[PDB]
């Protein structure tokens, strides 16, 4: 029979039945499953340091962002984008292709076709659950202990005065695997006193670090997460072949394959220079990158006044509403550029979510 996996070390965010205010630090903020009081109650240590108990039965206060740190894996599968084998964590199987699967990083990282609907297969014992397409689904940003985050020692700290003392601060340089069997479970920290080391952030449900300034850890399809209880659209090898004589490839760049960077610079080398929310800047062959977005916060844009097309564009991205009719042809301001490249636009006093093709720069 199917049974619940008490996956200590799971990286989680707030769930559908959440009613505990700002304990997590806000929606999308990440925490670590420390332990299970019972099959109905779980203890989470949020990246902001707040530790608390939550419901995981009947009511569900938590969603699983990443179970990979628990070491749970689907032997006999491979992610067809990054070639992780076995898939560790949640398994995502394309329902619309023959024998195609993604890992969590690649799935939330918009690999494969966004219009292809996937099965979620949370555990080896799980029955597969057909999802809506990513292209029509809401995407929010994860926040907490990620690259660029400002941290102090956490509750499970057992590493002497490597940080220079309790309360002394450092910067998360990179999220790493504490072990091969537990990916995405550690954070490498460069302390303000020049000391540096690797610390547990999820491994065996441990929390060695605590945010004083959380950082963005990429975006995810919230409603596709199971309850507890410029871009690069080319394969790595193609990128590698293209990067020869345009900056080359190193292993510090793996962020770029699933992370949206911003074109901060061009250069005389016929090449491009891109920064990422980690703080790193990287150089590329032009053919490696694809643009979107073409907009910036503050851009004035006119809403498309072809109703057929805006209906198509909005429905295609799961954002059509008849109440949008009076916005056609109106000029508005780009308030925010979402992670799925849709635009928060302020028009008619109100704000709406637009397919970027449904507006034109003034």
């Amino acid at each position: 029979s199917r049974v619940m996996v008490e996956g200590v070390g799971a990286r989680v965010v707030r769930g559908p039945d959440w009613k505990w205010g700002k304990q997590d630090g806000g929606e999308g903020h990440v925490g670590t499953v420390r332990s299970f009081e019972s099959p109905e109650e779980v203890v989470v240590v949020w990246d902001n340091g707040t530790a608390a108990n939550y419901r995981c039965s009947g009511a569900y206060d938590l969603r699983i962002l990443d179970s990979a740190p628990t070491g749970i894996k689907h032997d006999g599968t491979m992610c067809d984008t990054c070639r992780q084998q076995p898939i560790i964590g949640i398994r995502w199987k394309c329902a619309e292709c023959t024998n195609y699967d993604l890992c969590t990083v690649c799935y939330h990282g918009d690999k494969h076709h966004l219009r292809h609907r996937f099965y979620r297969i949370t555990t080896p014992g799980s029955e597969r659950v057909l999802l809506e397409s990513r292209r029509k689904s809401k995407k929010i940003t994860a926040r907490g202990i990620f690259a660029g985050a400002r941290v102090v020692r956490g509750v499970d700290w057992q590493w002497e005065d490597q940080d220079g003392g309790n309360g002394r601060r450092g910067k998360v340089t990179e999220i790493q695997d504490w072990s091969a069997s537990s990916p995405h479970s550690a954070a490498y920290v460069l302390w303000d006193n020049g000391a540096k080391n690797l610390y547990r952030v999820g491994f065996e449900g441990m929390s060695d670090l605590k945010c004083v300034q959380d950082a963005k850890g990429g975006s995810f399809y919230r409603d596709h997460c199971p309850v507890l209880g410029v871009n690069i659209d080319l394969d790595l090898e193609i990128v590698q072949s293209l990067q020869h004589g345009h900056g080359g490839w190193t292993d510090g760049m793996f962020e770029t394959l699933t992370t949206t960077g911003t074109v901060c610079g061009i250069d005389e080398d016929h090449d491009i220079v891109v920064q990422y929310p980690s703080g790193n800047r990287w150089t590329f062959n032009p053919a490696v990158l694809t643009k979107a977005s073409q907009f910036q916060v503050g851009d004035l844009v006119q809403v498309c006044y072809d109703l057929e097309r805006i209906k198509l564009l909005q429905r295609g991205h799961g954002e059509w509403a008849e109440a949008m009719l009076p916005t056609l042809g109106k000029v508005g301001r780009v308030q925010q550029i979402y992670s799925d490249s849709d635009l928060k636009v302020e028009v008619c006093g109100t704000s709406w979510t637009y397919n970027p093709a449904a507006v034109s720069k003034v």
């Binding site: 707040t50 530790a51 608390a52 108990n53 939550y54």
Partner: peptide, 6 residues
Amino acid sequence: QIKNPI
């Protein structure tokens, strides 16, 4: 550690 009613 916060203790929720639950």
